[PDB]
Structure 1
């Protein structure tokens, strides 16, 4: 349906605006806080399982302690003489003794669930801890991305160095053109040729001075 495609495109445009606003390193801190809240909720469920194991433990010890009570009352009645009453007390002692087995098995059963949820806690603890160390390395990688952007700004500064160097190269071309214009006027008037003829006569006089030193 075309309305479902338009709703998916609007949700994708909203997600693209969310990614454009995403903040470096702050998202990792928010993930660590969210993992801490999840660990507190998991610890509450583990605590409720441990409380069930403690309830069954208390009931077990209650059963044992009450069976000893019936056992003592049976001996009291036996010493008095009412033997049938002692047999009745022992009969109730048997009921308590047998119920001890059911609560014992239930207790060992709850130990398996306790260990299961404890293993889940341990693995999720590993997950949160690797989140911690991953953030440690990921903050170093995010700083390295900012340093790579600084290296790109140093390369981009080549455009500004080309503007300053091009302005200096234009001023140097104007100075060299003024010097060339003085040399072109001095050559075109014959003055450079007269100076070359005078330099040849000065070289002839230097050769005559070398011969005068040689003789």
Structure 2
């Protein structure tokens, strides 16, 4: 069974390995979206920088007004990135710990089989070793010598 049981784990572990990356892919995908939202926000800031010039602050106030719409998106999205960082870090630690456990379990699997054969190996000679005294072969020899 042992070889068979560990076979499913290999399929299981790759299932951990395969789709886990998707968690990161979605995470970093949001990071790029934040930069784009920040980029347009920077463009509005860049446009705002050109608004205050020449002594017309009225346009600058309006320009920053639209920015706050993107800042809320930047603020809300940015908060998610920090929150999701813990999930990706902790889950990776699980895999690293879990992988270390599986190999160790597999590392001891063959070692246990080393002693599993021992008793079968040891018993097969002990049963023959029981041929002494009044049992089996020596009993026949005891029978023979009596003969």
Deviation at 1:156, TM superposition (A): 4.0
Task: Map 1:1-215; keep pairs closer than 5 Å.
Answer: 27-76=1-50, 84-158=58-132, 159-170=136-147
Give the TM-score taking structure 1 as reference length: 0.56
Once the two structures are TM-superposed, the CA of residue 154 in structure 1 deviates from its matched residue by 2.4
Q: How far does residue 121 in structure 1 lie from its aligned partner after superposition?
A: 1.7
Tell me how far 1:67 sits from its aligned partner.
Answer: 1.1
| Mapped partners of 2:2, 2:56: distance in 1 | 78
- Cα distance in 1 for partners of 2:4, 2:41 equals 56
Question: TM-score scaled to structure 2, two decimals?
Answer: 0.78
Give ranges in structure 2 of 5+ residues lacking alignment.
Answer: none
Rounded to whole Å, the distance in 2 between the matches of 1:114 and 1:160 is: 69
Larger relative CO (CA 8 A, sep 6+): 1 or 2? 1
User: Aligned pair count?
Assistant: 144
What is the alpha-carbon distance in structure 1 between the residues aligned to residue 32 and residue 117 of structure 2? 56
> 1:107 Cα deviation (Å)?
0.6
User: For residues 70 and 53 of structure 1, what CA distance do their matches in structure 2 show?
Assistant: 26
Equivalent-residue separation in structure 2 for 1:125 and 1:38 (angstroms): 11
Q: What is the deviation of 1:109? A: 0.8
Shift of 1:97: 2.5
* Mapped contact 1:32–1:131 kept (Cα < 8 A): no
CA deviations 1:97-149 (Å, max 9, x no partner) are 23222112111111122123223223322331221122132121112122222
> Which structure has the larger Rg over C-alpha atoms?
1
For the aligned residue pairs, the C-alpha RMSD in angstroms reads 2.6
